[model samples]
Target: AMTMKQLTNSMDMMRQACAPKFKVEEAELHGLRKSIFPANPDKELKCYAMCIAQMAGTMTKKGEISFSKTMAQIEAMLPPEMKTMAKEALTHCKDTQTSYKDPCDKAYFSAKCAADFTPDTFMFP
Candidate 1:
């Protein structure tokens, strides 16, 4: 299995390749725009969001991760453009095998994970 560094590094490389046209964005970049006013966003939420940003990049090698199948599954639930974004985010998390603590954190990660891992992404892959 790939270590967290290798996973994150590979994801970074993929993101750079896919997003060469624009500055890469992390979830925190957008997360900060919202108020955490209702309650403190847990570290797990922060971690899950961080992982999502790491996963959003495209332009990865074939069989590097099974993105196509994942995309198809997500397309079932997401709007057209959203399917694409969802796929990109998920492909990274699936490739990386990242996990989180709280169920909400887990669900957040799994939302993307399901795209790639299909029904299985919601749990340990």
Candidate 2:
């Protein structure tokens, strides 16, 4: 377990690092929606998916999709109860990324993983 101050610092770093990267425009909404939605989604859902993916992308490095170290850092920042959820999400993210050959698609997988599994903590507004 990590200290509260350490967790706070990590949280702030993640937020500050990720915030600037989440600039989603309306024009790119369709592709993001198709990536996350099973059916035709409303404008709100599309925007949500776009924003989520964009932020997740920020967490990723460019060509090689890797989340183990990043996830471990964030997991240390999570409460004990939330740590399992973060691990599961990161595991799934890595699996999804591995399934995709393209870097962009891998990043989308990571974004969806964080959105689906870490909603309460990482995705809270």
Candidate 3:
């Protein structure tokens, strides 16, 4: 299990990796923590979620979600106690992308469902 510092550090790296590419403003990042999803997010927000999901290895570059990939990453990033919570949330969210057609939309809804399930553990930025 990663220490809390290590977990946050990993999350920050993922944020830096994808934040600039998406042009997600610092102000907007605050919303990610507040509520990982909006009732209606703009295209940029949707793509931004996809970018983070990609970096997190939960979503592929081709816009597909991968359960095995995330299980490993989550297993690495969280403690055994938290890992249980995350995996359960992920199980619930794994099929969320099927609700949408656009790849970005798929990522957004999946991420949204993930956060909704584990707001305390979910990290988007």
* Candidate 3, 1-125: lDDT as tens digits: 88767777887887777777765688777777555567687788888888877777777766788888888887777866467777888888787888888989988888778778885545566
Model 3 lDDT-worst window of ten:
116-125
What is the TM-score ranking, best to worst? 3, 2, 1
Write model 2 residue lDDT over 42-97, tens digit each, in one string: 43443343344345443344554446555655655566755676677777666666
lDDT per model, in order?
0.41, 0.50, 0.77
List candidate 3 stretches off by more than 4 Å: none
RMSD of each: 14.3, 7.1, 2.0
- Candidate order by lDDT, decreasing, is 3, 2, 1
lDDT of 1 at 71: 62
Per-model tally of clashing residue pairs: 1, 0, 0
Could you tell me how far off, in angstroms, the CA of residue 93 lies in candidate 1 after the best superposition? 1.7
Per-residue lDDT for 1-125 in model 1, tens only? 34434544654564445334444345533333221111345455434444433354212332133455456545654444344555556755653433443433444444444434433222111
What's model 1's lDDT at 111? Answer: 41
Clashing pairs in 2: none
